[PDB]
Design a protein around this motif. Sequence first.
Motif, PDB file in Angstrom:
ATOM      1  N   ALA A  21       0.825  -1.203   0.000  1.00 55.78           N
ATOM      2  CA  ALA A  21       0.000   0.000   0.000  1.00 55.78           C
ATOM      3  C   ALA A  21       0.860   1.254   0.000  1.00 55.78           C
ATOM      4  O   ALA A  21       0.401   2.324  -0.417  1.00 55.78           O
ATOM      5  CB  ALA A  21      -0.933   0.000   1.211  1.00 55.78           C
ATOM      6  N   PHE A  22       2.104   1.142   0.464  1.00 54.05           N
ATOM      7  CA  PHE A  22       2.973   2.300   0.605  1.00 54.05           C
ATOM      8  C   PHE A  22       3.687   2.659  -0.691  1.00 54.05           C
ATOM      9  O   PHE A  22       4.265   3.747  -0.782  1.00 54.05           O
ATOM     10  CB  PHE A  22       4.011   2.029   1.694  1.00 54.05           C
ATOM     11  N   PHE A  25       3.604   6.052  -2.244  1.00 51.29           N
ATOM     12  CA  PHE A  25       4.285   7.111  -1.510  1.00 51.29           C
ATOM     13  C   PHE A  25       5.778   6.826  -1.360  1.00 51.29           C
ATOM     14  O   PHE A  25       6.375   7.156  -0.330  1.00 51.29           O
ATOM     15  CB  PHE A  25       3.642   7.303  -0.135  1.00 51.29           C
ATOM     16  N   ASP A  28       9.331   8.601   0.531  1.00 48.88           N
ATOM     17  CA  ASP A  28       9.646   8.797   1.945  1.00 48.88           C
ATOM     18  C   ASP A  28       9.443   7.508   2.736  1.00 48.88           C
ATOM     19  O   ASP A  28       8.800   7.495   3.787  1.00 48.88           O
ATOM     20  CB  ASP A  28       8.793   9.918   2.528  1.00 48.88           C
ATOM     21  N   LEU A  29       9.993   6.399   2.244  1.00 47.89           N
ATOM     22  CA  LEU A  29       9.835   5.104   2.890  1.00 47.89           C
ATOM     23  C   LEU A  29      11.160   4.630   3.471  1.00 47.89           C
ATOM     24  O   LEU A  29      12.235   4.919   2.937  1.00 47.89           O
ATOM     25  CB  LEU A  29       9.296   4.049   1.915  1.00 47.89           C
ATOM     26  N   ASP A  30      11.065   3.895   4.577  1.00 52.79           N
ATOM     27  CA  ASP A  30      12.248   3.389   5.257  1.00 52.79           C
ATOM     28  C   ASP A  30      13.016   2.428   4.357  1.00 52.79           C
ATOM     29  O   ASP A  30      12.458   1.812   3.446  1.00 52.79           O
ATOM     30  CB  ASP A  30      11.850   2.677   6.551  1.00 52.79           C
TER      31      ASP A  30
END
Lengths: 126, 253, 236
Positions: A21-22, A25, A28-30
């Motif tokens: 789902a991320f 985006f 800006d993800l780890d």
Amino acid sequence: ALKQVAGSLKLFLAQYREVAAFAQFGSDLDASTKQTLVRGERLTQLLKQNQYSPLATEEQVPLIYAGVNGHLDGIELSRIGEFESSFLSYLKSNHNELLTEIREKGELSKELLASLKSATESFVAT
Amino acid sequence: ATLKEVEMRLKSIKNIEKITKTMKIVASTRLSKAEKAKISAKKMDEAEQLFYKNAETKNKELIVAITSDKGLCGSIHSQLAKAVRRHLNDQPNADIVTIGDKIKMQLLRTHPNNIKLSINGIGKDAPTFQESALIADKLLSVMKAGTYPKISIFYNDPVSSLSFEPSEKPIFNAKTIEQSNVPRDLFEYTLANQMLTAMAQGYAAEISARRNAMDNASKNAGDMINRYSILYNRTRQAVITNELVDIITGASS
Amino acid sequence: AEYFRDEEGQDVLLFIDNIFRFTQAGSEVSALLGRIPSAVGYQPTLATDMGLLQERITTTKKGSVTSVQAVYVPADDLTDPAPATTFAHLDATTVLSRGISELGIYPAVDPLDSKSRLLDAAVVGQEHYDVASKVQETLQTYKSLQDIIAILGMDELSEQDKLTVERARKIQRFLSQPFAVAEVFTGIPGKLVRLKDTVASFKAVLEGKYDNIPEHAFYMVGGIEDVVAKAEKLAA
């Protein structure tokens, strides 16, 4: 033999379902989520299969071993299938003893667990 | 309220809830990055305010107002506009420089006269020293910042990860700082650093507020999901009962 | 009522409470009479029975009958065959709603579903028609923004949407009114509002003349004069 390698697969695919789902985006993800996507997309690609083409366990366990232990991370996703079909062709001419033992015993001894790593890295070198 | 209508609406609100949770975690992620720039700017701002404090410096106007122009931040922009309006009614003669499109819109809905051109589009990310210095130079050369007897900067102070407060700070002009050519350059430089720190605090407050806003949005959507799940179950039972009544009447003709 | 209309030639008020109970009553006997049940169990003859009854109520060249009827709505379902068929027989309708009642907004009339033939610019004049249509436009916008207000809250609305929502909330609360009959259990003195006063008050509210009044000053008062007076009492 399949149960030994398929253990973490079940968890990695669930983590992949959670994180996917991320992906929209992504900026800006780890780094952990980036690794999770890298691994899960390749696992999802690895589980594709053609019709009328069933695989024996001797051929299934090496593929899922490569997938689960991250050897696929170094390969471009768009040709994982080309890898798999080639990888099996490698195992069936080099290290064919491993496939014979997987067939005969139905379980992976620690020697076979190490040998899968060695053969997988021998192939993934090219 | 057919079963299909309720199911479709339930799915739509579920999608909204998932989106809001994802955005909430993304905001929590950006907060960690914002905090570093906030800390860095706060150190320097305190360090150079210690000069005016030790020197015991003290006090037409120039009001700078800082927001990012980003939406979905909730109470940010309206709170800062409230504070700015409360200040401005006490000195209507002040000229204004809004940094950020949303706060420019706020101070155009009210007191539109006090600014011709707003600074927009640049307030996206954590303050870069280049961007802050360039904006200070624009204020000096474009806004004639060097001339005003008094200067104020309004920004959202990140009081907490869960809260923020509109805050205003003065800048003593070169002639004002003289009392306990170098003063003019130091005035411009101090304004540059002050603006940079204010914009860093504004960025941190913005990201914190967006985190909390997406949290509230997700929780509200979850409540709506509960309500529509109840309604869906009721509609399911009603549909089954009505169809079965039709069948039974057909049989017992 | 018909004897008063036709033979006495007089003008008649005819109140019926509750006409749905007539239709329902037939359903109770319908199965025992040997009829095959219609949809949701009503009698086959529902439409023609209700026509035969209700179209006697009409005014005629001999005299005038002004009939007010209360219609029950089973399970709040306005799609139920009885209310649905009754809608066709009326010149004016006033749909009371539980959704409005739960807000505490008595008399709980739904201002959008309630509808009348006479809300016509040729009957009520252009000013009344314009005020009513603007009121309904505002209320419909506010109802269209319910999901957004619930999820994101007021802050993210467009600024004129904020203004419209505030005026819609004030109009909602201004449509409430305390009846003298309800005083027994509401404790709020009964209040009565003339038509021209109502039109003037709502025109004033739409024009933003009272934007600065707190919305609770609009709740359960009659006329804008009482709104300002209650604003004074709330300011004290």
